[PDB]
Amino acid sequence: FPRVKNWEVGSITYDTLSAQAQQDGPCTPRRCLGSLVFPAPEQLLSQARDFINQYYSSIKRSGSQAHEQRLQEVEAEVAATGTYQLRESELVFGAKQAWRNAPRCVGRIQWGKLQVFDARDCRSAQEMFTYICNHIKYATNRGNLRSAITVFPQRCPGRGDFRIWNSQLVRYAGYRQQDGSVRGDPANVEITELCIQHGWTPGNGRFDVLPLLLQAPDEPPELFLLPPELVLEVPLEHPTLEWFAALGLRWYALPAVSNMLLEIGGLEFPAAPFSGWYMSTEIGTRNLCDPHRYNILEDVAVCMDLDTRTTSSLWKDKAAVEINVAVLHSYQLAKVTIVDHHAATASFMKHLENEQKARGGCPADWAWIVPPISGSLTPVFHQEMVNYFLSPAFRYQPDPW
Amino acid sequence: KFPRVKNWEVGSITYDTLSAQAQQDGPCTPRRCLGSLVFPPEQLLSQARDFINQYYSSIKRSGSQAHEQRLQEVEAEVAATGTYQLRESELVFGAKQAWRNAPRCVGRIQWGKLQVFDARDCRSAQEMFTYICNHIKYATNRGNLRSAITVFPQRCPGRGDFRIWNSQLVRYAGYRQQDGSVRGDPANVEITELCIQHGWTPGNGRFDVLPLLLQAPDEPPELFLLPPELVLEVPLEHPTLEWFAALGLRWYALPAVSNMLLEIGGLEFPAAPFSGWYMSTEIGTRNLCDPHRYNILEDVAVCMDLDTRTTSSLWKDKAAVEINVAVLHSYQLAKVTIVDHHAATASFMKHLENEQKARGGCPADWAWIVPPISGSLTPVFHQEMVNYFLSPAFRYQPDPW
Ligand code: HEM
Ligand code: HEM
Ligand SMILES: Cc1cc(N)nc(CCCN2CCC(F)(F)CC2)c1
Ligand SMILES: Cc1cc(N)nc(CCCN2CCC(F)(F)CC2)c1
Ligand SMILES: C[C@H](O)[C@H](O)[C@H]1CNc2nc(N)[nH]c(=O)c2N1
Ligand SMILES: C[C@H](O)[C@H](O)[C@H]1CNc2nc(N)[nH]c(=O)c2N1
Numbered sequence: 190f191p192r193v194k195n196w197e198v199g200s201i202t203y204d205t206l207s208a209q210a211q212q213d214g215p216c217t218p219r220r221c222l223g224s225l226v227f228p229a230p231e232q233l234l235s236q237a238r239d240f241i242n243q244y245y246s247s248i249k250r251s252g253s254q255a256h257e258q259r260l261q262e263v264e265a266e267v268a269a270t271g272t273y274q275l276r277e278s279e280l281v282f283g284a285k286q287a288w289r290n291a292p293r294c295v296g297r298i299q300w301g302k303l304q305v306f307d308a309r310d311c312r313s314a315q316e317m318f319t320y321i322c323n324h325i326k327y328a329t330n331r332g333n334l335r336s337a338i339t340v341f342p343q344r345c346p347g348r349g350d351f352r353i354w355n356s357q358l359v360r361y362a363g364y365r366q367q368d369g370s371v372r373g374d375p376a377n378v379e380i381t382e383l384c385i386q387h388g389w390t391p392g393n394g395r396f397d398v399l400p401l402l403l404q405a406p407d408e409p410p411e412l413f414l415l416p417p418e419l420v421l422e423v424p425l426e427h428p429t430l431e432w433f434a435a436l437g438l439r440w441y442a443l444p445a446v447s448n449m450l451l452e453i454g455g456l457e458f459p460a461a462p463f464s465g466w467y468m469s470t471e472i473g474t475r476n477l478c479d480p481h482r483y484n485i486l487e488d489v490a491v492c493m494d495l496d497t498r499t500t501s502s503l504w505k506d507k508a509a510v511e512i513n514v515a516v517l518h519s520y521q522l523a524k525v526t527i528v529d530h531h532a533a534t535a536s537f538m539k540h541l542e543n544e545q546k547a548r549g550g551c552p553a554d555w556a557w558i559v560p561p562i563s564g565s566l567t568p569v570f571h572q573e574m575v576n577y578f579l580s581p582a583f584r585y586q587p588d589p590w
Numbered sequence: 591k592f593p594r595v596k597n598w599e600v601g602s603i604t605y606d607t608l609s610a611q612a613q614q615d616g617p618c619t620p621r622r623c624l625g626s627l628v629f630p631p632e633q634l635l636s637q638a639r640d641f642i643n644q645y646y647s648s649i650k651r652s653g654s655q656a657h658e659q660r661l662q663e664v665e666a667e668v669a670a671t672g673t674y675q676l677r678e679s680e681l682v683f684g685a686k687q688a689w690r691n692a693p694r695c696v697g698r699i700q701w702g703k704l705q706v707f708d709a710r711d712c713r714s715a716q717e718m719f720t721y722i723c724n725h726i727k728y729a730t731n732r733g734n735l736r737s738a739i740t741v742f743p744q745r746c747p748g749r750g751d752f753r754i755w756n757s758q759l760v761r762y763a764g765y766r767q768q769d770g771s772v773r774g775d776p777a778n779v780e781i782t783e784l785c786i787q788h789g790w791t792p793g794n795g796r797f798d799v800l801p802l803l804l805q806a807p808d809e810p811p812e813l814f815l816l817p818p819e820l821v822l823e824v825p826l827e828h829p830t831l832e833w834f835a836a837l838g839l840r841w842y843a844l845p846a847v848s849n850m851l852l853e854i855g856g857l858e859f860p861a862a863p864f865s866g867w868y869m870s871t872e873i874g875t876r877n878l879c880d881p882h883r884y885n886i887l888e889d890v891a892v893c894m895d896l897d898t899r900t901t902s903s904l905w906k907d908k909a910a911v912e913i914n915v916a917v918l919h920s921y922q923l924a925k926v927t928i929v930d931h932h933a934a935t936a937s938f939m940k941h942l943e944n945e946q947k948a949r950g951g952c953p954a955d956w957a958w959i960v961p962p963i964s965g966s967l968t969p970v971f972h973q974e975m976v977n978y979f980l981s982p983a984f985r986y987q988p989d990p991w
């Protein structure tokens with residue numbers, strides 16, 4: 190069992206949970222690939238058997254009558270149909286475990302507080318849209334954000350998948366330009382071209398909210414415009430730099446990942462969007478300052494009168510700190526939930542302590558947990574971590590096009 | 591079987607073919623990644639053949655007379671004596687290769703410019719001290735720092751080893767109190783207690799340079815006071831915060847690592863101190879701001895009148911940036927070589943590109959190359975990396991007690 194040290198306090202623990210890691214990751218004793226972003230009834234049964242045992246452990250009925258009955262039931266359903274169906278409470282527990290098991294999420298202190306919307310009876314792309322609008326409405330909640338997931342029908346033999354082609358429910362268009370550049374968010378060029386190709390009349394702003402491309406089984410995707418009043422946004426201003434409002438910057442309130450696959454007990458839900466609330470560095474450091482995103486860093490530094498001709502002036506660091514200040518201030522002013530990287534990493538440390546007690550460890554991807562500014566100023570920098578895959582899980586999947 | 595490696599800022603793809611050589615298998619398995627953990631008889635001929643083969647390929651002289659001749663002599667020496675001695679140029683070439691192979695070193699663009707002092711004919715702690723003293727004054731060079739390594743005698747069976755008991759040649763004292771807490775550097779409270787225990791009269795200050803504990807084989811160590819005119823230090827002041835000088839902070843000029851074991855061609859040199867120059871985050875972010883180091887962060891924030899009452903004022907980030915500015919400014923005004931983390935990481939990206947052509951890859955430890963502040967503002971953050979062990983190498987080793 191791996192020995193794990195916290196270097197700020199000196200404390201030492203052993204990750205016994207890691208020995209139960211089912212699926213394999215990309216590293217070998219030859220080489221570590223930790224920094225890479227993207228590294229049969231019999232196997233369905235054993236996956237399902239393990240999830241069911243997990244579920245009956247959580248409700249304190251391990252080995253009970255109801256426990257054996259459900260195993261027997263699942264094997265009989267897989268025999269007669271090649272698949273099986275989750276009970277509603279198994280689905281709720283499975284969605285919470287998937288979040289709990291997500292190594293790259295620093296927000297997991299919250300994992301038990303998750304609203305699960307059961308959309309498995311969903312019948313079309315049009316009904317899919319209504320479920321999604323209600324998800325956004327519930328989760329936004331006028332700025333007091335609530336964590337939620339909506340679960341659409343599972344992958345099953347004989348029919349195609351429900352898919353949300355958008356990587357998030359709320360995304361800004363990215364328009365390739367006259368002179369080869371991008372207007373808007375360069376991360377979203379591909380889906381933007383798909384929306385236009387599928388009938389959308391583009392705008393030409395930098396913060397144009399994209400429509401949804403929704404795929405019902407064995408159907409082309411269908412375009413759905415989001416109602417403007419369902420998309421809460423936050424104009425960005427700085428508490429002391431008044432010229433900052435003149436940049437015209439904005440971000441949206443709700444982070445809602447919609448392109449990941451939810452796997453529970455061998456069943457696969459390729460459409461199961463989920464949302465929480467932002468950590469300020471995602472917006473201020475990554476989305477605004479990444480050279481391949483909005484890339485505003487030098488424009489802000491010039492405005493601040495910083496000496497941008499030498500790196501040793503630390504102009505990049507100084508400009509990025511004020512951009513993050515502006516994000517926090519703007520979301521607090523608008524009364525939209527947001528967490529700063531110090532509060533979030535501090536709460537993640539409590540999660541590791543709760544999880545060491547509860548499960549004997551906790552899967553964590555160090556490079557993703559440590560924030561992209563001020564890393565060693567946060568307690569997670571000084572914490573060794575063990576990264577591995579547990580199921581139930583959120584998995585990546587290829588884009589449907 | 592050749593890891594695909596992407597850079598996310600540009601979109602470029604490379605393949606690390608060099609990874610196919612990895613010797614000392616690392617800590618990761620397909621089941622769990624341990625990339626974030628700090629510290630995770632005639633086999634000698636195998637590593638000797640391989641190193642000699644390395645040497646001759648690097649001089650474009652493989653498979654030609656001088657190559658075969660050197661192969662037989664190492665055979666004859668190990669057959670007769672059970673070990674072998676390295677030719678001068680081989681020792682020079684191996685020291686540079688060990689630097690070049692260090693996955694945690696961001697400064698390897700400099701790997702080809704290294705001064706090797708051959709101290710293999712040494713005997714006793716008095717000879718070490720004059721060797722170490724020659725290194726220090728050469729490397730310091732009145733602040734125009736020059737990378738250097740001094741190679742003390744190799745290890746042989748039956749007889750003890752040369753060891754420098756200090757982790758660095760310049761370290762500051764750490765003294766406990768009437769209450770456990772430490773005045774000075776808490777990273778060195780152990781070796782401070784050993785220095786006091788071995789006859790040294792401790793100071794009171796927060797920046798007292800410790801004496802050296804040098805150990806010749808099979809003999810107890812001996813304390814050595816370092817010549818004060820040879821320990822070049824830099825008082826810390828800020829360009830515009832006139833009170834920063836009053837905090838009385840200093841750091842020394844020469845980062846000289848004296849606890850790592852140099853290993854070339856199966857031979858092991860437990861005393862081989864190497865040095866270069868500091869990246870400024872090492873001093874200003876880790877040494878001065880780490881909670882378990884000098885921990886000065888809040889004291890600077892109080893002086894800057896920052897609001898330490900809520901983490902979302904980003905007061906830690908602001909004070910950290912200004913501490914780093916003061917380090918760069920102070921070293922520049924003292925005319926002592928230093929490199930900021932933007933300049934350093936940009937040169938490392940160049941080093942990666944050089945090494946892709948020269949060797950088809952580069953072992954790099956992402957969590958150690960990315961700087962501890964402003965990580966995603968530097969290019970290395972957006973570069974996927976592959977970590978693995980090549981030989982020759984610098985390796986960690988147990989404390990000599
Ligand atoms: C409640 C507030 C939450 C916070 C503050 C938070 C925080 C974060 C952050 C900072 C990341 C890294 C994202 C990136 O750099 O792209 C992340 C990733 C992730 N989060 Fe959370 N999260 C929250 C809610 C949730 C919820 C409700 C779920 C699922 C039910 C979830 C599941 C995940 C997953 C699967 C990832 C991995 C994304 C990827 O690998 O690309 N999170 N989270
Ligand atoms: C000349 C300029 C140099 C710069 C800017 C530089 C920079 C760095 C930095 C920032 C680290 C991280 C260490 C830490 O965070 O504690 C490091 C590690 C390391 N460097 Fe370099 N270094 C330089 C010279 C050298 C030289 C001359 C050697 C050997 C001949 C070397 C070998 C190593 C090794 C073995 C490590 C790993 C240290 C450890 O694991 O604690 N470096 N370097
Ligand atoms: C729920 C949630 C909360 C939060 N605060 N932040 C996020 C950002 C996730 C971004 N992540 C990028 C890669 C991907 F697209 F593949 C999957 C999503 C999500
Ligand atoms: C050569 C060099 C250059 C540089 N710029 N910085 C360093 C810092 C290395 C610090 N490292 C700490 C852990 C250890 F003690 F084990 C070994 C030394 C070294
Ligand atoms: C290549 C590198 O792994 C990549 O840039 C990662 C690093 N860590 C990250 N961490 C988070 N939270 N989000 C990210 O997108 C990334 N990107
Ligand atoms: C636990 C974690 O691996 C540890 O704090 C590491 C992270 N990255 C680092 N990177 C460098 N350069 N130096 C360090 O000491 C560390 N510490």
Ligand SMILES: [Cl-]
Nearest residue numbers: 444471472476
């Ligand atoms: Cl985002």
Ligand SMILES: [Cl-]
Nearest residue numbers: 845872873877
């Ligand atoms: Cl140091």
Ligand SMILES: [Gd]
Nearest residue numbers: 428429430431
């Ligand atoms: Gd102002």
Ligand SMILES: [Gd]
Nearest residue numbers: 435436488492
């Ligand atoms: Gd402008």
Ligand SMILES: [Gd]
Nearest residue numbers: 892893894895
């Ligand atoms: Gd004052």
Ligand SMILES: [Zn+2]
Nearest residue numbers: 216221618623
């Ligand atoms: Zn690994």
